[PDB]
Design a binder for this molecule. Sequence first.
Ligand code: OQ4
Ligand code: OQ4
Lengths: 462, 462
Amino acid sequence: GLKTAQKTLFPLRSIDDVVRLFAAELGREEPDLVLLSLVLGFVEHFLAVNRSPAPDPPGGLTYFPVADLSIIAALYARFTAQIRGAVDLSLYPREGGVSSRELVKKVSDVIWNSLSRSYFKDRAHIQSLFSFITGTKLDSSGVAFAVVGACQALGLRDVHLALSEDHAWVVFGPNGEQTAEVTWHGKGNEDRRGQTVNAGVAERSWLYLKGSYMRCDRKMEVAFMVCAINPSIDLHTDSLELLQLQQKLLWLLYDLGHLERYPMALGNLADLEELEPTPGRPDPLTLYHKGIASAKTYYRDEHIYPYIYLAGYHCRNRNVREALQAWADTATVIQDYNYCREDEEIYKEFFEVANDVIPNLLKEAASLLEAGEGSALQDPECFAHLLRFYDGICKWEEGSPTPVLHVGWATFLVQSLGRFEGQVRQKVRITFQSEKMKGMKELLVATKINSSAIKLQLTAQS
Amino acid sequence: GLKTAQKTLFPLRSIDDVVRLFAAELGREEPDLVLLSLVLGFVEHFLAVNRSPAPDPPGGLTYFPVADLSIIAALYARFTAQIRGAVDLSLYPREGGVSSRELVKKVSDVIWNSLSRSYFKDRAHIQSLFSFITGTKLDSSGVAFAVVGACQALGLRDVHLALSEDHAWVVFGPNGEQTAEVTWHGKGNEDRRGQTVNAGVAERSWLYLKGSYMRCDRKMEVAFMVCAINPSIDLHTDSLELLQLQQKLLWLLYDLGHLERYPMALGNLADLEELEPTPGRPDPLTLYHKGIASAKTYYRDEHIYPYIYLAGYHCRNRNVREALQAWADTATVIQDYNYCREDEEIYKEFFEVANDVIPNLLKEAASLLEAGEGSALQDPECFAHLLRFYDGICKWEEGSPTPVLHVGWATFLVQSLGRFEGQVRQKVRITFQSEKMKGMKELLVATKINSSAIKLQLTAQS
Ligand SMILES: CCN(C(=O)c1cc(F)ccc1Oc1cncnc1N1CC2(CCN(C[C@H]3CC[C@H](NS(=O)(=O)CC)CC3)CC2)C1)C(C)C
Ligand SMILES: CCN(C(=O)c1cc(F)ccc1Oc1cncnc1N1CC2(CCN(C[C@H]3CC[C@H](NS(=O)(=O)CC)CC3)CC2)C1)C(C)C
């Protein structure tokens, strides 16, 4: 049952009306996760899922799907009735505002058992409670979010969303010290629903961030649903309206302090600001730096994406030195992880940096150097950043249950090395931490680069 | 030839961006009438002229046509180049910032000779310079507005819009003391273009308001184009977007003091607030009473529509006593006019009030009274307001070159009288101003209503 103060801000007829609803909910101690997620999913459904005067507006039309109270109230009542109907709190000895693992598992099972048996896990627009209620489809992290929403609907104030950079689960109990898996991760992995994350933290996988993962409060859970907005209409086109809505909502959260402990939300906001800068706001670079400051302050500098967001920006702006330094800093965080079997998404990022982005950046630099025959390619410190990147990757691989380096990496390493003259490479000042790079130090600086020797040494398993 | 400060808040992506452009222009000594009218006309053209999840948005969509600088700048340059191209200011000596009548007539003829030869004069969405430039079509008052816009584009600071409650012309020269007709009025009337309004003022027609017409400054000309917004998509549906735009622009004008001397704009704003109240704003009644205060203060209480706006609100809200008092007040203004051959629009309003609106209001009161077998029909003051309404109509007729009353008015008078019992009618002690009502004062209050005697008196000559 929606309170009177919630009803008076319907109907929603614009992006600013949505922003106003978020503003009002975020002024409460319990922003209503179910109401806000239903609204975002409704809007995304109709802007993305179900997508002499000029004969059509010459600058295009933008659209907004009117959200009537009668529609949103009906979806809300359906969700709350399903959860309250399925969970008898009197059956769950819950001593002093701490939920039991058995109660968290019950709520989790109610969400899980409601889902359609068959759908693609990478399907777009199945993140929201709108998708849950109207299509019985949720994506992996959508299940975790829906468990937290369901727990809020039951008054279980201790159940919160936990987030790594690629996975979601719940924290509960006194001080949020208990953990439970509530959803799947990846494809064809062992079912760990119900389990703690203690094994994941101990194994030093990126997926569990060595325990430096996000423990959300209710306001951060609102920030999560805003980052979860998916503007994609199809493979090659985005809803401008959903980008603008996400941008405005992230600025609201920013102003209220709710992105302070949310590095990826700051990087998301920086990316939107690069697309369309907001008058009077910090520039993207300031926001990427705030993301890194957040990771340093709250997460022991154990996050990878803050550095990837920054390096990406420098790449797009042809800041060759700064991009290489940021990719070096990325590798310096990953080297203190072990590459585990559910870490593939961050492997994909390092693969793309090593084998595509760095080669294209150094190629652009080679073209600049040619035109008017000081370049990053003539700078030993820039070469040192390239080597520090590879050193971090090699150190990440050490002690890991899955290999990282393959002969394909060696091809790109040889191409990247060859962008720097022998006399520049021979001036490099570096101490390596990885056995592989220590072993390869003569090959990396040789005037004539030996591709066969670099391939053998980079890909050794020994 | 747009200034840099104007370009920076394109593109316009929302209703609030349009409001921000109006706010910026209204902070200048010469708000740019051509830019503002082009923007409103562009937005109106694309929002009204050219316009388990539900399969279609269940509350519909709202739209906004993005207004790019390149589109609006192109239309602006077309207008300014056409006017500056066609009018050689070197041929019209102009000491002391007073335009000559021949200069005003030239600019008027340039607008007039640009128009399409054949189009419906009451066509919707041909009020703006957008319509003029892209369709060579303007409605009656649109021509007057475009003459003023063209004079501003030529730097003629003394040329202003004049409007009555049913007509527009221009005022110019020292103190706006010169007048020129620049457009047509009504259908099948003799053309007065190039003439002063002196004959209209002297005849005491409603059309020229006995000289108590609006003499706009540039800020009031902005208020005019905002009132001119036409949200109608077709006979039975309005653009919510254009209603919201008009409402927000009228509140901007209100806050800046620009509706102080604009009774009809205050009535328009009251009507919009009744449809969709703005949190924290005065209620409709406060606004209707501000409109009447404006008419009393600045226009000698010689305007009709302020009272019609109030009467209309009370009618819609079934406030029978207050509606009749407001119609009585409307008749008390008209009685000091002469009914002239181009006053048809206000004749239609009085005819409809006498022969439809008051009959329906008294019938509804009679139904309420029947169901409780106190009523407005038991209130002598309600009867006195009905008599004052007819008394003002009869006094309006006196000395008029067009008769007002005829046998078509008699049956409704007799029926309205008969809604009040003899004992109620016999409590009033009033002295009539009209010869016609004086000549049946006993008949109006007699226990038995003599319908044929009242008809003979109401239809008597003069
Ligand atoms: C994006 C969807 N999403 C998650 O993937 C997610 C799910 C979880 F359970 C836990 C974490 C999750 O990630 C995020 C959570 N909160 C906010 N943002 C999240 N994102 C943004 C994310 C990382 C960055 N990338 C964009 C990068 C990709 C690499 C790119 N560098 S480059 O290779 O192009 C160099 C030029 C820069 C932009 C998008 C996806 C993951 C959430 C928001 C539902
Ligand atoms: C509205 C269009 N318009 C004019 O008609 C106009 C043109 C002129 F040359 C000179 C005056 C003009 O009138 C206005 C000027 N400025 C603002 N508003 C003008 N209006 C509003 C206007 C009078 C009132 N009526 C509305 C009444 C009609 C009766 C109604 N009674 S009811 O409630 O029982 C039925 C809903 C109450 C509201 C609409 C048209 C004329 C201008 C703005 C271009």
